[PDB]
């Protein structure tokens, strides 16, 4: 019977704040840049449609003394941070970017056709682009955001798969990594495996697996500590209607229509897909640059961040604007030519983070200790309670070893600087450790925290 | 605060448990089985059978599931908190109904290992020919028995053991044996009194016995080892009756492995120049059946049982094994392929064999709770921890910690289906072992006066009313 | 209340099963007597009972 | 989707525009009791979900 964390925790009188200076990122939207022979990246691939993952460390409070420390016993207890309120700054001038693909499976317009279409040749693919669904979201919690996507599994073995069969589908959770892609409205799946053509969608998503949050499974967590909070806004509407062109997988049973002739002798491809179209952006639906205030969340955590660790993940479509510039290789000739000008594409990124925090202590009993150890026992390691008596009676040093009379060949125990088991999972990083301050008044954000609760502005 | 003291060796199940004031019953309608006595019927090419072999001479297994204590409704539940406690069924009393008329069956074999009849011999017999094997049948020993417990029934049988290596095995040697314990399975063959063993590996001629027992392993229960259990929970109760007697005196015809030293006799001559086979075997026969010998169709009632189990059926689970020899009679009928011709023709009639089978189960039960300390938990987890698995442990800590549970994606999926074709995890530890099943779990009733069985249960103790 | 005041009960014979293993014309050779009369009407199903 | 010669469906036809119909069974309350049931007579009365 999991309980509300607010049972045993106690709230203190003290608050702090710290925040990064700012964050800044530059990259090309469409593909990463690398030396042609080498594999080393020359320029990182970045675009707004990439997700963002922020990992934030806190320094251990219990290393951090206080102006007056007497009010608790640091022996019998600990200190753990709590996250009251959060902000996300975004500074760019708002504007919509865009993507396309030079080759795209397409037949022709489905909206209006005077006469029946032409015969299918080989490779009618064309250069056409579209706007992605506008979207805004925000994610906060102590465990990484859990993603999900479509994907291929292994077919049950009865019929041996021949090339050209329909691969069965599988619903798959995974941890979410940076650089991963929002839905365009084509749904979370692996194009790379499930789309052989590789030309069926615009570039940016062709490589990787777009993913999407599952509120259910996440919120389904018993502790809720995946995410305790969130917001989302998004919209879309239709623009155009097209046709795939390719080998028909299956033909409709005739009985659902009547045989044609002449022009109607043959059936055009059955497929259709919409072209998503972003809508008018407003300054209103912006969910950012405005404070937030948390008291109660759906999970039992109330702003507890275990292990001095905290996660934020945010994605915007509104700043997607892509500036394009031109350099001149020859500055002399006065006759304009398309020869003289190379073109490059770079995209801007601007983030800022400012986090309120609250300070909290924990009493211990067995019940306490037990209940935690159930939840996540690794947490106990970074604290001092867990004992754990060691062994180690005798050793033999034989010195010295380079002396080339052979005593045994040697020391094998590096293995445990390892702390993050998720070190396999890469994503953007920032360290705050140094930045705390003890007085709200000196910051833009905090004084609102005062204003919300009022209290004195403090004398002078 | 660390595991505390108190006593055990084992203990009375009636030590800690308490009894409630409430009872219930449920029971099947009935069951039915038909099949061929001797051997199952399959399509010649297909391994899958057309018809199963069925005989009373086959052992019968029964395994009965029960519903959760915790999900189940009571007229008055006040008396307890399911927090600090659990609840488990109690088995007070049990019945076996049998509805068929009683009569003997029989079995035999068309090619029987046979020498002669020494029960009467007017002259020295003939001498070894080739394949004199004959067709005879016999009546197996009339027998009844009943077995009840929360744990699988254990029988025992002979088996051929791995010899040692000093002298290598020569063809035709007598392999040494090891008496083997094993779990009892459905359809297994009741020993006829020829010993619990594998005829297959031990008897190569395959012509020694009637068909039914030729292949498989006839088994026999060990009271000792069963009763020897520390918990008694193998079986907490039982009954048996059986009888048999001699009929004929015969011999085995075959080459003699080891021969009688002369010192035991005087060397013969002429018709006595040759020792006739000294292997004799009796003809087993059943005797007159009686209404009286029925140990069935009458209620049984328990208060103290030999083990420590009193009526406790763990894991919502219960086992019963039964043996009837009385109803063994097998009917036979003739299907004429040609109905026209008026003269009798052997070729006109295909012949068939099927046998009737009738059972029922009607079970009283009592309801009981367990107070919890670590002591308790200690002892059971000591005994078996698995039973703590199915429960929430009365709770895992005093505040109910949880496993980061499994909430699934399952119920229907993509026509991909590793999503289960490989179905729900865990196991029946005996899922390997095959034997019959029935579910009663819906059938309970809260009022006994409904039923023939239960109203007796009153009459035994008397109602004074039926309250609560 | 098989019947109007509180006697209760529907007193012809109730339960029967004829099979176990499979030879005889199956338990389901007769129709299913108990009905949601809408069984004619198909549609998606879920069981919560547990 | 169905086998061409057969009538057996190979793949079920589904789209969002199909209506959905969910049927939900509940277990009878009056088989199912409570931490404390004394508050009522189950004989003279019944229980029904809401």
Short mmCIF file of N, CA and C in Angstrom, two decimals, chain D residues 20-35:
data_model
loop_
_atom_site.label_atom_id
_atom_site.label_comp_id
_atom_site.label_asym_id
_atom_site.label_seq_id
_atom_site.Cartn_x
_atom_site.Cartn_y
_atom_site.Cartn_z
N UNK D 20 -17.50 1.83 -31.99
CA UNK D 20 -17.06 0.88 -31.00
C UNK D 20 -18.20 0.59 -30.06
N UNK D 21 -18.26 -0.65 -29.60
CA UNK D 21 -19.27 -1.05 -28.65
C UNK D 21 -18.58 -1.84 -27.55
N UNK D 22 -18.63 -1.33 -26.34
CA UNK D 22 -18.02 -2.02 -25.21
C UNK D 22 -19.11 -2.57 -24.31
N UNK D 23 -19.05 -3.87 -24.06
CA UNK D 23 -19.91 -4.50 -23.09
C UNK D 23 -19.08 -4.92 -21.89
N UNK D 24 -19.62 -4.69 -20.71
CA UNK D 24 -18.86 -4.87 -19.49
C UNK D 24 -19.68 -5.66 -18.50
N UNK D 25 -19.15 -6.80 -18.07
CA UNK D 25 -19.82 -7.61 -17.08
C UNK D 25 -19.32 -7.25 -15.69
N UNK D 26 -20.21 -7.29 -14.75
CA UNK D 26 -19.78 -7.20 -13.38
C UNK D 26 -20.09 -8.50 -12.67
N UNK D 27 -19.27 -8.93 -11.74
CA UNK D 27 -19.65 -10.06 -10.91
C UNK D 27 -20.79 -9.65 -10.00
N UNK D 28 -21.68 -10.59 -9.75
CA UNK D 28 -22.79 -10.36 -8.85
C UNK D 28 -22.25 -9.85 -7.53
N UNK D 29 -22.69 -8.70 -7.07
CA UNK D 29 -22.33 -8.29 -5.73
C UNK D 29 -22.75 -9.30 -4.71
N UNK D 30 -23.89 -9.93 -4.91
CA UNK D 30 -24.46 -10.70 -3.82
C UNK D 30 -23.84 -12.08 -3.68
N UNK D 31 -22.86 -12.42 -4.51
CA UNK D 31 -21.87 -13.42 -4.15
C UNK D 31 -20.70 -12.84 -3.37
N UNK D 32 -20.51 -11.52 -3.41
CA UNK D 32 -19.27 -10.89 -2.99
C UNK D 32 -19.50 -10.01 -1.78
N UNK D 33 -18.86 -10.36 -0.68
CA UNK D 33 -18.99 -9.65 0.57
C UNK D 33 -17.87 -8.65 0.78
N UNK D 34 -17.74 -8.22 2.03
CA UNK D 34 -17.13 -6.96 2.42
C UNK D 34 -16.21 -7.15 3.61
N UNK D 35 -15.42 -6.14 3.98
CA UNK D 35 -14.76 -6.23 5.28
C UNK D 35 -15.73 -6.40 6.43
#
